[PDB]
Amino acid sequence: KKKNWFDITNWLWYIKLFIMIVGGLVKK
User: Fold this and answer.
1) Where is this protein localized, as stated in its record (predicted)?
2) Non-local CB neighbours of 18 within 8 Å, separated by 6+ positions
3) CA distances from residue 22 to 1, 11, 17, 18, 19 in whole angstroms, order as listed
4) In degrees to the nearest 10, what's the CA dihedral of 18, 19, 21, 23?
């Protein structure tokens, strides 16, 4: 609709955060 590639970078960060959260919660 009104979105661009410049806003898709925010969605990429959402999955990137899961790697940080599990990367520290898998070893705990």
Assistant:
1) Host cell membrane; Virion membrane
2) none
3) 33, 18, 9, 6, 5
4) 160
Structure tokens at 25: 């919660």
Please give the method by which this entry was determined. NMR
Residue-wise burial string across 1-28, b where 16 or more C-beta atoms lie within 10 A, e elsewhere = eeeeeeeeeeeeeeeeeeeeeeeeeeee
For residue 21, what is the DSSP state? H
Which residue type is seen at 28?
K
